[PDB]
Every structure is written in C-alpha cells, then in structure tokens.
Amino acid sequence: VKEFLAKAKEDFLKKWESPAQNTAHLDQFERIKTLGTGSFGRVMLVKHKETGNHYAMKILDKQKVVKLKQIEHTLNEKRILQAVNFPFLVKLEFSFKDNSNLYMVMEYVPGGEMFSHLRRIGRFSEPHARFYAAQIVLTFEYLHSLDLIYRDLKPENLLIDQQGYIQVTDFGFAKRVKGRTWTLCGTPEYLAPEIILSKGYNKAVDWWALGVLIYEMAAGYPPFFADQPIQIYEKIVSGKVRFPSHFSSDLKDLLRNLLQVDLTKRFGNLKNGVNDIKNHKWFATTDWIAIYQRKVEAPFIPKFKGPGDTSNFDDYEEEEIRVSINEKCGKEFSEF
Amino acid sequence: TTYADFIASGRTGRRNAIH
Ligand SMILES: N[C@H](C(=O)N/N=C/c1ccc(O)c(Br)c1)c1ccccc1
Numbered sequence: 001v002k003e004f005l006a007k008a009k010e011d012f013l014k015k016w017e018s019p020a021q022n023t024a025h026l027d028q029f030e031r032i033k034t035l036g037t038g039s040f041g042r043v044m045l046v047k048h049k050e051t052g053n054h055y056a057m058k059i060l061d062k063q064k065v066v067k068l069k070q071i072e073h074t075l076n077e078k079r080i081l082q083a084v085n086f087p088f089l090v091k092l093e094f095s096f097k098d099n100s101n102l103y104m105v106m107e108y109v110p111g112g113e114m115f116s117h118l119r120r121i122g123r124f125s126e127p128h129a130r131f132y133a134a135q136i137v138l139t140f141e142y143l144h145s146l147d148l149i150y151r152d153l154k155p156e157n158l159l160i161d162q163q164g165y166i167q168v169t170d171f172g173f174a175k176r177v178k179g180r181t182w183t184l185c186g187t188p189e190y191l192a193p194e195i196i197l198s199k200g201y202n203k204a205v206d207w208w209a210l211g212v213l214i215y216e217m218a219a220g221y222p223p224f225f226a227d228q229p230i231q232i233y234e235k236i237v238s239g240k241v242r243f244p245s246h247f248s249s250d251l252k253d254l255l256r257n258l259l260q261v262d263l264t265k266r267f268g269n270l271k272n273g274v275n276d277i278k279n280h281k282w283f284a285t286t287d288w289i290a291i292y293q294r295k296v297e298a299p300f301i302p303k304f305k306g307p308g309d310t311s312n313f314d315d316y317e318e319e320e321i322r323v324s325i326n327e328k329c330g331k332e333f334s335e336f
Numbered sequence: 337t338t339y340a341d342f343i344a345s346g347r348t349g350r351r352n353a354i355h
Contacts, residue, residue, distance in 0.1 A: 039352065068355050115350060122339075156350050173353070187351050221342035229354070244338070 005145045008085070012146050015083035016176070021336070024094035024105060026323070029057060032308065034316040036113075038172075040064035041101070042319075045108060045310060054308045055093060058104040059321065062329040065102070070172070071332050073185070077171040078104060078336055086142045087294060088135045090159065090169040097336050099324045109167045111160035111302030112312030114217075118155050123220030126248060128299040130283065132158070133214050134291045135166045137283075140210065141274045144203045149175050153209040154187050155216065164298025177202075188229040189222040193261050196233045207268030207277075211258025218251060219244050223259060250282040 029046040032054075036043040041060035048055060065074050081092045081104065094105040114132070118124065124132070136153065143150055151173035159167045173185045180200040192208035194201040215223045223242075224235040239261045243252050257280075260266035267276045278288060290296050302312055342348060 039355065070355060119348065152353060154351065185354060187353050189347070189351060220339060225342055225345060225347055227346045242338075 005142070008142065009146055011085065012083050016079065019079050019335075020082045020095070022096050024096050024103075026096070026098060026103065029055070029105070031057075031321065033310055033313075034318055035310070035313050037316055040068055040070065042316070045308065046105070047308065054108045055105045056090075056108045058106065060102045060104075062097075062101060062333055066329050066332060073172055073175075074102065075333070075335060076173075076175050078102070080148060080174045080176060081106075081171045084143070084146070084148075086139055087292065088139045088166055088168055089142075090167045095336070097333060099327045100322065102333060102336055106169070107167075109159035109161050109169075110304055110309060110312060111162060111164070113156055114158040114160060114166065115155035116312065116314070117160065117300070117302075118217060118220070124217045125299070126218060126251060126282075127285075129214060129217035130286060131291075131296070131299050132166050132217060133210065134283065134286050134288065136168070136210055136213065137274065137277055138288065138292055139168055140203075140206050140268075143174075144206070144274075147176050147178050149177060149181070149203050150206050151175065151186050151209075152190075153206065153213055154190055155213070156187075160300070160302050162302065162304055163294065164301045165294060188232045189216075189224060191233070191236060193237050193239060194263070196236055202269075204263055204266055204269040207258055207266060208260075210268070211255055214251075214258070215241075215243075215255055218247060223255075248282070250280075250284075254280050254282040 028049055030049060032045040032047060034042055034044050035056055041058060043056050043058045046055050046057045060074060065071055078095055082095065090109065091107045092104055093107060096103050152170055157170040159169055161167055175181060180202050182200050184195060186195065190209045190212045192201065192205040195205055212222055224232055226232045226235060241259050257267040263269060268274060270276055287296065305311060
C-alpha cells in the first residue's frame with residue numbers, strides 16, 4: 001500500500017506538472033441528452049463519432065464561471081482530474097474549450113446517481129452502505145496521499161457503474177494543498193463545523209463528510225437537515241447527532257468518531273490515519289484488497305437496457321448549446 | 337418520525353453547492 005501510493009504519486013505528479021490540454025473538439029461528438037445540470041453548466045450524454053463510444057460531457061459556460069468567481073476552482077478541477085487514476089474515480093477522456101465554453105469529456109456511468117437510487121429505495125442496509133463507504137475510504141486514502149482535498153462528497157456526485165461499484169465525480173472543489181485552506185465551499189448538509197466557523201481547515205473535512213454520507217445512506221436522511229442552510233449550520237455546530245433506532249452499535253460508534261467536532265479525536269485525522277477507519281469494527285467484514293480489486297459482489301446491479309440507454313437518469317429541459325463568434329474570457333482560462 | 341420530517345422538508349431534491 002505504502003508502495004502502491006508511492007508509485008501512484010509519481011504518476012500523478014508528472015501529469016500535474018504537464019497537464020493534457022486541447023485533446024478533442026466539439027464536432028467530434030454527437031449530443032444525445034442532458035444528464036444533469038449545475039450553477040454554471042450542464043452534463044450531456046454524447047457519442048464520439050469516430051469510435052461510437054458514449055461519454056458524459058460537462059459543459060461550463062465561461063462567463064457564468066467568471067460571474068460566480070469560480071475561475072480558479074474550475075482550473076483546479078480540470079488540472080487535478082486529468083492527473084488522477086483510481087478505480088473509483090470517473091476518468092477524464094478529453095478536454096477542450098471554444099469561444100463560449102469549457103468541455104470535459106468523461107467516461108459515461110450508465111447506472112445513474114446514488115442520489116436517485118437512495119431516495120427511491122429510502123435507505124440502504126448496513127452491508128449495502130458499507131460496500132459503498134469502503135470504496136470512498138480507499139478513494140480518499142488515494143486522494144489525500146496526493147495532497148488533494150475533495151470537498152464535495154454527496155450522493156448526487158456518486159455514480160453507480162454496470163458492476164454496481166461507485167464512481168466519484170465532480171472535482172469542482174478539489175484542491176491540491178499542503179497546509180490548511182479557508183474557502184467556504186461544499187454542500188450545507190455535508191460541511192464540517194470548522195468550515196462553517198471559518199477556522200481554516202484540512203483534509204479532515206473529507207472524513208467528516210464521509211460520516212454524513214454513511215449516515216445518510218443508512219438512515220435515508222442526513223444527520224443534520226432543515227429547510228434553510230442557516231438552520232443546518234446551527235445544527236452542525238451544535239454537533240448533537242441522533243441515530244435511528246435501527247443503527248447497529250458499531251455503526252453508531254463509527255459515526256460518533258467521524259462526526260467528531262474535535263479534530264484531535266476525529267477518525268481519519270489521527271496518528272494511525274485511515275487505519276483507524278479501516279480497522280473499525282463496523283468494517284470488520286470488509287476485505288479492503290478485494291474491494292479495490294473489484295472482486296466483491298455488489299449488493300445492487302443497475303438495470304441496463306442497452307448502450308447509451310439513459311433510463312437511470314432524470315429528464316432535464318434540453319437547451320441549445322450556443323457558441324459565440326467572439327472569444328469570451330480568453331485570458332482567465334488560458335491554461336485550460 | 338424523523339423520516340416523515342425529512343420527506344416533508346424542502347431539501348429532499350438534489351442539493352446545490354454553495355459558492
Ligand atoms: N455536479 C454536477 C456534476 O459534476 N455532474 N457530473 C456528472 C457526471 C459525470 C460523469 C458521468 O459519467 C456522469 Br453519468 C455524470 C455538475 C457540476 C457542474 C455543472 C453541471 C453539473
């Protein structure tokens with residue numbers, strides 16, 4: 001493992017220092033359907049004309065990125081995404097830009113969002129939730145070893161592949177940082193107290209977020225919720241967590257250690273690092289190497305009724321992709 | 337129940353990031 005990560009870091013650093021750029025163009029893709037939207041863009045299912053492969057194409061409007069002050073985050077996203085490689089990270093296949101937009105063309109994950117499956121089914125069983133959580137634990141072990149903080153874990157950003165394994169997407173808040181950082185970003189339900197309190201923070205925020213995710217998966221609702229974000233923040237800072245009566249004692253113990261306001265005590269962040277999590281009793285039945293190797297039988301296999309099928313995704317209003325005849329924000333996105 | 341409270345809340349749909 002120490003050996004594996006060392007080699008992983010070597011690979012990452014070469015790509016980090018010499019990013020891939022301009023590796024395709026828009027007309028090589030046929031636009032099929034909108035798979036999702038966000039504040040400054042959308043993700044579309046596309047077909048690559050020369051191979052017939054399907055991809056998910058994230059299209060970000062440069063002007064909207066600038067208005068929302070997300071230029072540096074967007075540059076982070078692409079630079080980091082093109083440099084990483086892990087079984088549970090969605091792969092970036094191509095990227096390019098035109099007068100209007102930035103494009104990131106990623107592997108297509110046909111099983112849909114965990115969010116969709118979780119809301120419909122209500123909640124996952126503990127073994128089911130454990131299976132997904134293990135994969136997140138390994139992914140965060142990988143990312144953090146590269147000095148990356150992920151900062152946007154939630155079921156909306158986790159996709160389920162044809163084999164029932166998870167694929168993490170959305171590196172919009174990912175950041176390579178050795179010290180501590182201060183940006184107030186993420187999703188309200190998932191924010192660690194130190195982010196809310198403007199303390200400056202580190203990778204431990206990802207481990208808190210993992211606690212929120214596990215809780216949400218197993219309960220069917222997050223540990224801290226309300227109608228308005230301000231009310232959510234108040235609950236988080238109080239930190240009083242209540243668990244459903246059906247949560248096992250082991251699960252509760254793990255969650256009390258992840259949803260731990262005290263940074264000297266939060267799991268993931270101590271002397272033993274990720275091992276405090278990997279060796280916790282709730283994970284006793286988990287074969288970490290088999291998980292990594294994808295040799296474990298998934299608890300749930302998405303229904304796939306053909307290639308390019310999209311029945312696992314919600315329908316979104318389809319809008320025209322317009323490319324201005326003038327270059328927008330060229331200087332801001334020069335490195336993209 | 338907490339579940340009923342969640343389901344009746346305004347945050348059971350996809351949640352936006354704060355920027
Ligand atoms: N948060 C949204 C996001 O990153 N979706 N990623 C989806 C995705 C990625 C790869 C896939 O194979 C599939 Br299928 C879906 C988003 C962020 C910014 C603008 C619009 C949407």
